[PDB]
Design a protein around this nucleic acid. Structure first.
Lengths: 132, 377, 100, 63
RNA sequence: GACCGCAGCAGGACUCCGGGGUCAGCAGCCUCUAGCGCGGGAGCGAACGCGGCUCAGGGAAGUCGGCAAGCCGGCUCCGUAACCUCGGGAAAAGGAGUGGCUCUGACGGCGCCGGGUCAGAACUGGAACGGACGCGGGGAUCCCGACUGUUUACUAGAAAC
RNA sequence: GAGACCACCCGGCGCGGCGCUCCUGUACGGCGCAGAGCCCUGCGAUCGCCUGAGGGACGCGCCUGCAGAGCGCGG
């Protein structure tokens, strides 16, 4: 929802990110990023607040595994500058399984969530315990 | 055969030849349009880049994530010492283009301008302008030349020199430039305005306004001979590549049988005359004013000079113009600034709540040395 | 005439390979003395050589205090530079202590 | 200006400088510089480090 | 250091004697004795090459193939799977400790008088310790040849012999 | 501030100091009613204090000091 401001995209394709929701997915492999035009040789890149197509790891519930699913990045270890000059980073790269319509597969989100993801996706902000 | 995969070309062919700038400093080339019937104004000023700062400002862009929010942006301070007008030049729009209809110099020319006319001042005849001062100094000769300009000149320009003494750089010779007089009801009104400014300092505050956009012309930082990876931005080859990987692998096809001007080739990387257009002017002020960089938030003295002084520049003794963002060139390099030819229509109103006066040498934690003294005790 | 001048050996070997520090530093002292005593020929006392190489070829002491004495006459003007040993280099600058 | 404080250096961070890190503990740690951060990341204790104001509080330098 | 390769040729060519420290070491790293400063010197600190060093976030998405690098590694104690020709696998896989000081036990030859290993405890130190050096990354499969060996000196070390 | 060499931009340069600021992280030494303990009244890794110290700098300001502009070449 809404125009975003370019931030530093720290997660290239192949990044395995932790899963913050209670979807029974332990890790989310990153197949690709939504709204990515490409340049020759450039791996798709994703930042906080971005829909990426993920695949649940072997550790995940089998029902969720073997399916390409949309997810929103809510944490990133790469430091990024908000237009207010604030440079922020998370301890771990994370994601929540969301449908393009914003609906969350998991009821709750365990851990801190970034402001960018909370503002872009209303359902993330409502379920977030904290929005740092 | 075809390239197989579509990729753009690396680099702008418009900026070729990428050679060391022959022109000594940044040159204005095209000045902003006259817009006859506007107020009479000077379109350009020369200053020397002091350094960057970082300021907090209140954004009023409607239709934005930052509307009614605060943003920290890079600001470049260019030390602009007052420039004394020394001569008026008039050009006519002939069928062969703008052709000079003579320049009328002042009756008394300052020593910094004189220094420009010799390679070494101490070992020189110092004969420049000797006859002219004798012919002039009554003003009658100058008046006749001004009248000739009113009768035959279409474009009036002022020749002014930066006084290098007021700047920290080790120059002594003054940089002399032409500043087009614009906005005139008549050419003679333009000559009259220029004559008033003759032998008289001109200030940035009386050339440019705050919130207005300028174009910064200057030669850029130089890196010397560079490779095609760091000159044209070409892809480094895989590390298995024998004979090195930092090179364009194929410099052309069998036909044409001669390398093209497009193909990327190693050579000079910096010292290029560039123009950075549409930079908005955050503040024009004097360093002599003690509270120039003080804001309602600061509640301290705060002046343009940072703690520890400007790295690789100096003390900015006099007037300065702080622009928004980066301009071409390193510190000390002259930057000619002109009114923007094509300004960005939608630019956010400038409101500054904080300017960084912390040390740019190292990491500074204190805006002013009195705070540093208090902390250490 | 005698000149007491400090030379920063760390500035002289800056920009030069660290293996060539001490032989470069010896050359630098001769050139600086040539400017200081306006003589073409500079002769360094073995004490100056011993001090520069005290920490080996890679590291030169940060500063050297040198007593340089103009000797000779009638175009035989030369400088004999001996190493002065000082506890610290504080408010130390060149001293044209020598008269005549 | 609005100025925070390093969570390790214990020194005021002027606007526009430093980095913030939010850990899974849900706490935002404002850091003066990479040195303030790396000392915290490598677990090094700030009551051991002399410059940090936590040491200065402990040894009565900043009582 | 003079032999043999056109040469006072980063090429080969048989032996004898072989100190100290660190260490399991004739390893590596420094040094005593002895030898000695090699077909040349300066300046500069471009691209590029070569021999290295480091790199945010991700982690093979690069590529014909993880080529190259990187990881691992010393010792002590735990803890070890399938399979197997019962010998192995196996350092399987994995973990944990390690410095310096100040002590306490053991162990011979006693009055004496030697030992230098193996334990155990305090106390310390930016959360540090095989602090340089030396020094396996590992696991699951399939094909082939049982194995140790051997080979096209100077493009094939292989499943070939 | 510019560079392979040249050229370019500047020039009484520049060297050594003194401040300022910044980097690292509290110097040697002295002391102590610190110290596990030990055996001696001595040893001892460490710890505190003096000491946001000491050391450093290629950034800024200054000079209190030696200096620094060819009777060189063209012309």
């Amino acid at each position: 929802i809404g125009n975003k401001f370019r931030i530093s995209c720290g997660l290239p394709v192949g990044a395995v990110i932790n899963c913050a929701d209670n979807s029974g997915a332990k890790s989310l492999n990153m197949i690709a990023v939504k709204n990515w035009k490409g340049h020759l040789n450039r791996f798709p890149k994703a930042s906080v607040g971005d829909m990426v197509l993920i695949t649940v790891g072997r550790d995940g519930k089998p029902e969720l595994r073997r399916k390409v699913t949309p997810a929103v990045v809510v944490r990133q270890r790469k430091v990024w500058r908000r237009k207010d000059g604030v440079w922020i980073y998370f301890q771990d790269n994370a994601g929540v399984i969301i449908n393009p319509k914003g609906e969350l597969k998991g009821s709750s989100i365990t851990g801190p969530v970034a402001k960018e993801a909370a503002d872009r996706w209303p359902k993330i902000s409502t379920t977030a315990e904290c929005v740092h | 055969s075809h390239r197989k995969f579509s990729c753009c070309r690396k680099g702008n062919l418009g900026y070729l030849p990428r050679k060391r700038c022959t022109r000594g400093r940044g040159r204005c080339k095209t000045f902003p349009p006259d817009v006859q019937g506007a107020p009479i104004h000077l379109t350009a000023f020369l200053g020397y880049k002091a350094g960057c700062t970082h300021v907090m400002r209140f954004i009023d862009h409607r239709g934005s994530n930052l509307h009614n929010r605060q943003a920290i942006d890079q600001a470049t301070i260019i030390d602009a010492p007052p420039m004394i007008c020394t001569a008026i030049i008039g050009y006519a729009k002939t069928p062969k283009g703008l052709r000079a209809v003579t320049t009328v110099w002042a009756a008394h020319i300052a020593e910094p301008a004189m220094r420009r006319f010799y390679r070494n001042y101490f070992h020189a005849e110092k004969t420049a302008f000797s006859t002219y001062m004798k012919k002039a100094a009554d003003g009658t000769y100058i008046k006749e030349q001004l009248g000739r300009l009113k009768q035959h000149a279409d474009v009036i320009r002022i020749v002014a020199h930066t006084q290098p003494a007021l700047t920290p750089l080790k120059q002594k010779k003054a940089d002399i430039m032409e500043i087009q007089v614009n906005g005139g009801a008549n050419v003679a009104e333009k000559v009259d305005y220029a004559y008033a400014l003759m032998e008289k300092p001109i200030s940035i505050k009386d050339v440019f306004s705050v919130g207005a956009q300028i174009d910064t012309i200057s030669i850029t930082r130089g890196r010397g001979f560079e490779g095609v990876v760091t000159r044209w931005g070409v892809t480094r080859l895989p590390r298995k590549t024998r004979r090195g990987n930092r090179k364009v692998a194929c410099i052309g096809a069998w036909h044409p049988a001669n390398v093209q001007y497009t193909v990327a080739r190693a050579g000079q990387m910096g010292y290029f005359h560039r123009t950075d257009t549409n930079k908005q002017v955050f503040m024009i002020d004097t360093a002599e004013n003690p509270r120039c960089c003080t804001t309602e938030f600061d509640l301290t003295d705060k002046s343009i000079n940072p703690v520890g002084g400007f790295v690789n520049y100096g003390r900015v003794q006099g007037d300065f113009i702080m622009i928004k963002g980066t301009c071409p060139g390193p510190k000390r390099r002259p930057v000619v600034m002109r009114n923007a030819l094509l300004p960005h229509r939608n630019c956010p109103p400038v409101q500054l709540q904080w300017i960084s006066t912390a040390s740019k040498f190292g990491h500074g934690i204190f805006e002013t040395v009195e705070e540093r003294r208090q902390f250490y005790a | 005439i005698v000149y007491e001048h400090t030379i920063r050996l760390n500035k002289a070997v800056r920009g030069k390979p660290s293996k060539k520090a001490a032989p470069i530093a010896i050359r630098a002292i001769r050139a600086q003395v040539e400017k200081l005593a306006k003589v073409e020929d500079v002769r360094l006392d073995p004490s100056v050589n011993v001090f520069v190489w005290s920490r080996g070829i890679r590291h030169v002491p940060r500063r050297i205090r040198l007593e340089v004495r103009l000797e000779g006459d009638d175009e035989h003007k030369f400088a004999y530079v001996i190493n002065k040993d000082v506890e610290n280099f504080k408010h130390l600058t060149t001293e044209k202590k020598g008269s005549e | 200006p609005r100025i925070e404080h390093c969570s390790f250096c214990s020194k005021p961070v002027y606007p526009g400088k430093g980095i913030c890190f939010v850990r899974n503990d849900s706490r935002v740690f404002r850091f003066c510089t990479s040195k303030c951060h790396r000392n915290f990341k490598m677990k090094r204790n700030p009551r051991k480090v002399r410059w940090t104001k936590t040491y200065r509080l402990l040894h009565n330098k900043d009582m």
